[PDB]
Nucleic acid binder design. Structure first.
Lengths: 70, 96, 55, 103, 121, 159, 59, 49
RNA sequence: GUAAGUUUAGAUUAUAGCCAAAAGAGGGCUCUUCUGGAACGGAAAAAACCUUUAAUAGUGAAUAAUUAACAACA
């Protein structure tokens, strides 16, 4: 039930750096793992929608927290 | 990369399966048609699943119901003997 | 009234970008594609034709 | 019911974050087909060859000529007739004797 | 005849709202520019081609460090449409001989003097 | 009728359906329970083959034990030598998978490989397009290569 | 998984039968769905040389 | 001489793919019925029963 | 800000251009003057318009230009 732009973009916002070549391998050869990634991308999309509609200071989504490096 | 029955030749796989299930005191399986496509054409696909006590043990694909049903038997046997495709890789790590 | 309407249009226009600013400041190097008269006329005149809605 | 995808067809997705927040854990067990959703095998009346012979029934003119035979074949397999014609010796001698095999 | 042009001086006199938007105090001006070429010099007049070579901006998307002094600024105005300018920033101070080998420039414009490639925690 | 009420019409509501996310407090408890179960599965060793996605050279490879990989440059490793691949982005099994953000921790996963062959590529023809091309205005490119065999993938119960 | 080689290949490349209902629909939007399945672009194993189409029935 | 030592006698020609696996799948290869929900009594669409 | 410039010695070839964009002059041509161009991407095909610092291997990645645009009252 996902369009291509939504799927790819939201995975990036979760700090997942799999490339297109390897993603095709999982879909063909790892159907259950691909489904798990599908839910993750969908959830992050929903969190973004909630943050957009709700305005002001509100707690950020569980999966919308970005790990930092230095 | 070698499948079990490629190295061992077994005819009538269902007959062997029935005896093996008896040893562990399990009821004989019930064959049923889980999925179907293009039955009336010349290229049909069949999925047959062996159900035990209303619980699924194996599922197999085939061109014809008889072929698909026989395929389900081999899938079941492999799981019983633990020679599945996704089994633990052999271990050459040991230096001893 | 026409002159008064013209003044009103300039003051209340909501477009941040106008022909005059870009031409005079040579943003994009736009002057490569323009004539000297464009700076004077400010895009309200093209050939012999007058544009009544250009602001 | 935290998973945003229905769990009824392929697998059950359970997604969790570790305490440190550096790893994502996925639990996906398989879903088996319910017994109530299956049909009985039609035991009363099968090799695929027998199916083909019934489909490719030779009724008139004994073995048919090329053209009529090809029209019968195209209907059975849902193709056009052009597929079934042969080729000349130039193309047949170019074909590889032993093409490579992967696994 | 297409020729070199002179920009009116008013363009470079800022407004109070601009200071808020871009966040630069009209006092304590920054010292070093970061400049990158983001367009091409083909189909442009020869004076612009020469200046780009003077400023070292031959390769696109590679930053160059320059002084924020009037003589340099006069040249930058000529090629303003082909470049991007960002002020330099040194949160942790200028690099010393000890830290010279551990600097790294961020996209924000900050020259950090320690780079460990580890989570901040 | 409350203020700001619009009767139902075709355009009254947006086409999409708004959803309600689960509350944070309960979700965190469920997250901890899920992690506990998976760690027990690792601890008891209830898994078969494992497959990992490893970033090596400049490329990403889906990998499993006994697999063969070809790297298109020299490596400086002798033949028959064992190595450890240190950038792993995903490890998976039949029932569970682990994802790094963007990389997994060193403790969790260890992948080892061996150098099998060091070779060169077959000749590749490069012939630029130019007026008066000619058949001798041609170059042959051959690059060095190396082959690695993946040996093992291991996990530990430290989630 | 754990199938034999030939049944595994047969299952993956099998051709499916679909049904569409056209009452009150616009013909253009119906075509988009039908074209997608006829070419086989709904399968992750799609390739232009693999002949992976499906049957579509419209009423 | 060192190059000859490292080589295996296999022919140096075009190699179709960089990667070779004999066990490509752990969870099972994709077929059209994966990701399709079943139905009660196994009723194909519009079958009355 | 930046790395060229003059003098000495030797040497040919070339001496008809084309299109786009400005300003004029004889009234669509015809001259004079300043700027730009010669894709393997784009504008439908596309010397001259737009994006483009050289050229190498790879089953990696981020981007640029990008023929379409949403009949009354007031």
């Amino acid at each position: 039930g996902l369009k291509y732009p939504a799927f790819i973009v939201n995975l990036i916002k979760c700090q997942v750096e799999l490339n297109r070549k390897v993603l095709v391998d999982l879909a063909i050869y790892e159907p259950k793992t691909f489904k798990s990634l599908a839910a993750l991308a969908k959830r992050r999309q929903q969190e973004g929608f909630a943050a957009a509609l709700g305005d002001g200071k509100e707690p950020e989504g569980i999966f919308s927290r970005v790990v930092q490096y230095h | 990369g070698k499948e079990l029955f490629e190295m061992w030749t077994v005819v009538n796989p269902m007959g062997l399966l029935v005896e093996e299930l008896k040893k562990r005191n399990i009821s004989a399986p019930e064959s049923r048609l889980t999925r179907q496509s293009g039955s009336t054409t010349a290229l049909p696909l069949y999925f047959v699943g062996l159900y035990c006590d209303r619980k699924l043990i194996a599922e197999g694909p085939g061109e014809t119901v008889l072929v698909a049903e026989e395929e389900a038997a081999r899938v079941a046997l492999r799981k019983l003997y633990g020679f599945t495709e996704n089994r633990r890789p052999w271990d050459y790590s040991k230096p001893k | 009234r026409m002159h008064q309407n013209q003044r009103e249009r300039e003051l209340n226009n909501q477009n941040p970008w106008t022909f005059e600013h870009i031409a005079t400041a040579n943003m994009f190097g736009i002057r490569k594609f323009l004539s000297p008269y464009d700076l004077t006329q400010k895009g309200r005149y093209w050939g012999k034709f007058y544009m009544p809605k250009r602001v | 019911t935290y998973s945003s995808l229905p769990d009824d067809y392929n697998c059950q997705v359970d997604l969790a974050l570790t305490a440190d927040g550096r790893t994502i854990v996925c639990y996906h067990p398989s879903v088996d087909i319910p017994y109530e959703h299956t049909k009985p095998i039609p035991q009363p009346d099968e090799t695929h060859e027998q199916i083909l012979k019934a489909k490719l029934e030779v009724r008139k003119s004994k073995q048919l000529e090329q053209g009529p035979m090809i029209e019968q074949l195209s209907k059975v397999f849902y193709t056009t007739k052009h597929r079934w014609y042969p080729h000349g010796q130039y193309h047949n001698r170019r074909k590889k004797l032993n093409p490579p095999r992967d696994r | 005849k297409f020729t070199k042009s002179r920009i009116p001086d008013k363009v470079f006199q800022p407004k109070p709202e601009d200071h808020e938007k871009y966040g630069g105090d009209p006092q304590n001006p920054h010292k070093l520019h970061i400049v990158t070429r983001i367009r091409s010099t083909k189909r442009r007049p020869y004076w612009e081609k020469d200046t780009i070579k003077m400023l070292g901006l031959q390769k696109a998307h590679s930053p160059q460090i320059h002084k924020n002094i009037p003589s340099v600024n006069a040249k930058l105005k000529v090629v303003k449409h082909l470049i991007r300018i960002q002020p330099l920033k040194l949160p942790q101070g200028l690099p010393t001989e000890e830290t010279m080998s551990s600097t790294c420039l961020k996209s924000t414009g900050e020259l950090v003097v320690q780079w460990h490639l580890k989570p901040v925690e | 009728y409350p203020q700001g009420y619009v009767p139902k019409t075709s355009l009254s509501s947006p086409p999409w359906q708004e959803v309600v996310l689960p509350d944070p407090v309960e979700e965190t408890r469920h997250h901890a329970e899920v992690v506990k179960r998976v760690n027990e599965l690792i601890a008891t060793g209830q898994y078969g083959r494992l497959f990992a996605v490893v970033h090596f050279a400049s490329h990403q490879w889906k990998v499993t034990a006994e697999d063969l990989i070809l790297i298109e440059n020299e490596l400086d490793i002798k033949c028959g030598e064992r190595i450890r691949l240190e950038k792993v982005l995903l490890v998976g099994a039949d029932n569970f998978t682990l994802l790094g953000k963007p990389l997994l921790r060193k403790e969790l996963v260890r992948v080892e490989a061996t150098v099998i062959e060091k070779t060169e590529s077959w000749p590749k023809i490069n012939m630029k397009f130019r007026k008066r091309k000619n058949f001798r205005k041609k170059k042959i490119i051959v690059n060095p290569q190396t082959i690695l065999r993946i040996n093992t993938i291991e996990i530990a119960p430290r989630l | 998984s754990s199938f034999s080689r030939a049944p595994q290949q047969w299952a993956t490349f099998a051709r499916m039968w679909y049904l569409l209902d056209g009452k009150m629909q616009p013909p253009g939007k119906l075509a988009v769905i039908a074209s997608n399945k006829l070419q086989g672009l709904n399968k992750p194993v799609y390739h232009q040389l693999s002949d992976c189409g499906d049957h579509v029935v419209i009423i | 001489v060192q190059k000859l030592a490292d080589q295996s006698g296999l022919d140096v020609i075009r190699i179709r793919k960089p990667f070779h696996t004999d066990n490509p799948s752990i969870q099972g290869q994709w077929h059209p019925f994966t990701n399709k929900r079943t139905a009660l009594h196994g009723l194909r669409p519009r079958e009355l029963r």
